[PDB]
């Protein structure tokens, strides 16, 4: 809860430099991988992405938050982003832009206040910050120190209590608060639910994330304030496993990366003397169709389906394109 090194002209500059001709970052077809590879500097067009995306989205406007506290936070952001093969800044430009596709183009925006989706298109740039490719069962599991300190502290979500308090490190300096326009009540329900949202992507608390959203769901008059929060904590999860509503071609692309790290996991694993599960381990797998058949079948489609059924009709594209996905990778094992 500290200050940070100061974003500089020649940082904001270069950004905002970036073109993205024949882009459209609204679109549900819209292509990270082609976007990354149309230029040497892929680590500026994604923040340009990011930059485009909420300042045409007419939010940051409405609250308070100026052009240039907006970008100076994209890069305070992409600066405590690590060198790791999935869990880096490309996959949270990718959740806030997916999310954006949630709220205007499966028309989620009407069941949130404009402020809500202020605070999730935000809150999706923070959720994985300083993510070091480990999950919390590797820190647990193996008494890494930071695994030490949930043990003796009590909370076993190490990753997204670590990912919350540097988002609240970063928003400590008035130059990229983008939440410093906002007044009393306003400011405090803002930082509420963005650690909320946060804390809520633990896939540990996936289940209970997930009945809490569909029984809100069922009488929202009853308590809407539950249901608004509710509704933000499965946005934000919903973005977060949504590698598998793409395009075929991209969603093959995510598959891989994410693999990989699954992989070393297991190789540290190893080494520290632990029994892996054969899941993360390189000499218990072949190709990828049937884990991310399985993926499909044991998480996304089920939570996709409900949550649409439930009451988010607009994004019925979603499941649709899961189920498309799922049968080529079928075709894949059947050959
Ligand atoms: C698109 O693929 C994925 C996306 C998210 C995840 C996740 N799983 N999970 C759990 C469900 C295990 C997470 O906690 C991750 C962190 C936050 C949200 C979701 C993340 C896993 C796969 C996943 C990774 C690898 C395989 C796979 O095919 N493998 C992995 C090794 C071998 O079994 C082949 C399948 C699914
Ligand atoms: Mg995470
Ligand atoms: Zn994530």
Same mark, same amino acid.
């Given at each position: 809860v500290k200050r940070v090194t100061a974003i500089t002209k020649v940082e904001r500059e270069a950004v905002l430099v970036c073109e993205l001709p024949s882009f459209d970052v609204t679109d549900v077809e819209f292509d990270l991988f082609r976007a990354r590879e149309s230029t040497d500097k892929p680590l500026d067009v994604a923040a340009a992405i990011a930059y485009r995306l909420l300042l045409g989205s007419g939010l940051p406007q409405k609250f308070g938050c100026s052009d240039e506290v907006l970008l100076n936070f994209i890069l305070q952001c992409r600066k405590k982003y690590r060198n790791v093969p999935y869990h880096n800044f490309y996959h949270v430009v990718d959740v806030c832009q997916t999310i954006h596709t949630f709220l205007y183009r499966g028309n989620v925006y009407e069941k949130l206040t404009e402020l809500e989706c202020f605070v999730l298109l935000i809150?999706?740039?923070? =959720? /994985?910050? /300083? =993510?070091?490719?480990? +999950? +919390?069962?590797?820190?647990? $599991?193996? @008494?890494?120190p930071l695994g030490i300190l949930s043990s003796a502290s009590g909370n076993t979500s190490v990753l997204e209590v670590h990912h919350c308090n540097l988002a609240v490190e970063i928003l400590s300096d008035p130059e990229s608060d983008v939440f410093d326009g906002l007044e009393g009540a306003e400011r405090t329900l803002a930082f509420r639910s963005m650690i909320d949202c946060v804390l809520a992507t633990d896939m540990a608390k996936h289940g209970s994330a997930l009945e809490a959203f569909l029984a809100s769901a069922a009488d929202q008059s009853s308590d809407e304030a539950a249901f608004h929060r509710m509704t933000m904590e499965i946005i934000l999860k919903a973005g977060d496993i949504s590698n598998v509503t793409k395009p075929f071609d991209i969603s093959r692309q995510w598959?891989?990366?994410?693999? @990989?790290? *699954?992989?070393?996991?297991? /190789?540290? @694993? $190893?080494?520290?003397?632990? @029994?892996?599960?054969?899941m993360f381990d390189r000499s218990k797998n072949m190709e990828?169709? $049937?884990?991310?058949?399985? *993926?499909?079948d044991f998480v996304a489609a089920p939570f996709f389906q409900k949550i649409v059924d439930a009451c988010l009709q607009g994004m019925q594209w979603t499941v649709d394109r899961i $189920?498309? +996905?799922?049968?080529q990778w079928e075709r894949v094992l059947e050959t």
């Open positions: 809150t999706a740039l923070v =959720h /994985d910050l /300083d =993510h070091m490719g480990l +999950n +919390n069962s590797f820190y647990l $599991k193996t @008494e890494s598959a891989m990366a994410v693999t @990989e790290e *699954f992989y070393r996991q297991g /190789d540290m @694993e $190893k080494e520290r003397g632990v @029994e892996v599960l054969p990828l169709a $049937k884990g991310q058949i399985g *993926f499909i $189920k498309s +996905n799922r049968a």
